Amino acid sequence: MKVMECQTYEELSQIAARITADTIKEKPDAVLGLATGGTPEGTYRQLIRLHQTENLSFQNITTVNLDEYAGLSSDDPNSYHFYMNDRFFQHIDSKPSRHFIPNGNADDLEAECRRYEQLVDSLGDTDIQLLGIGRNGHIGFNEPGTSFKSRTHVVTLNEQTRQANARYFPSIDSVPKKALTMGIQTILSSKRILLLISGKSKAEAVRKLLEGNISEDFPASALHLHSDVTVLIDREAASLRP
Numbered sequence: 001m002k003v004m005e006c007q008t009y010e011e012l013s014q015i016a017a018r019i020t021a022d023t024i025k026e027k028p029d030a031v032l033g034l035a036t037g038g039t040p041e042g043t044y045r046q047l048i049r050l051h052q053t054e055n056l057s058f059q060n061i062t063t064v065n066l067d068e069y070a071g072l073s074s075d076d077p078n079s080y081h082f083y084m085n086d087r088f089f090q091h092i093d094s095k096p097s098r099h100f101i102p103n104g105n106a107d108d109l110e111a112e113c114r115r116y117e118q119l120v121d122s123l124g125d126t127d128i129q130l131l132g133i134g135r136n137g138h139i140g141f142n143e144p145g146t147s148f149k150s151r152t153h154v155v156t157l158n159e160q161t162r163q164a165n166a167r168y169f170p171s172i173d174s175v176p177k178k179a180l181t182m183g184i185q186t187i188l189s190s191k192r193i194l195l196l197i198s199g200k201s202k203a204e205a206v207r208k209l210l211e212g213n214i215s216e217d218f219p220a221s222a223l224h225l226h227s228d229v230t231v232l233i234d235r236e237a238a239s240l241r242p
């Protein structure tokens with residue numbers, strides 16, 4: 001694992017956007033695994049900037065997202081479909097039909113997860129997979145206790161995850177209880193992983209990640225088993241490192 005301390009969130013975002021841009025330009029038909037949440041917001045903003053300042057093209061890219069909340073339609077402002085469209089897809093010259101995200105509003109969520117996993121395989125897996133980290137070490141919505149062999153599946157969100165994400169919802173009662181997520185094995189199949197970590201809320205998770213104990217109780221520890229992981233950590237997130 002390569003760990004890079006960044007002075008600021010803005011520097012983390014610059015470096016992340018550059019690494020993602022590198023993947024896109026080396027392989028214009030790259031498959032990018034993407035993430036939502038607060039952490040990658042700056043990365044998407046900087047990618048869009050590079051679209052202007054460097055004439056960076058997204059025309060032949062395919063993307064797959066980690067996760068989607070169960071029970072939300074694509075037009076719901078709290079869906080990850082909406083997030084990706086608003087923060088990214090609307091601003092780039094991609095082919096819209098090549099952006100894939102699990103359908104949290106499907107009638108049979110188990111079947112949706114099986115089809116999604118099958119799609120990711122058919123794409124040739126991801127060329128790069130962007131990740132964030134939960135306060136509890138989750139990756140995607142693979143909560144503590146998830147098998148490292150897990151594939152895309154329906155999960156019941158831990159209360160800590162609902163507590164963390166409540167900031168984005170009108171009320172605590174609107175925060176979904178379940179989600180669809182790429183599994184740990186789905187993530188580990190990527191050619192390259194880029195884990196982004198920002199802010200004091202993640203400092204305990206950073207400490208656990210860097211201490212290097214490998215176990216299902218801390219999902220992100222699965223990344224110690226991958227051959228090409230880069231972890232970008234800002235100063236605030238690095239404050240409790242061992």
Ligand SMILES: O=C(CO)[C@@H](O)[C@H](O)[C@H](O)COP(=O)(O)O
Binds near residue numbers: 036135138139
């Ligand atoms: O799957 C995802 C993102 O698609 C989640 O694992 C988040 O990365 C994590 O919950 C951190 O969220 P933020 O702190 O970035 O809001």
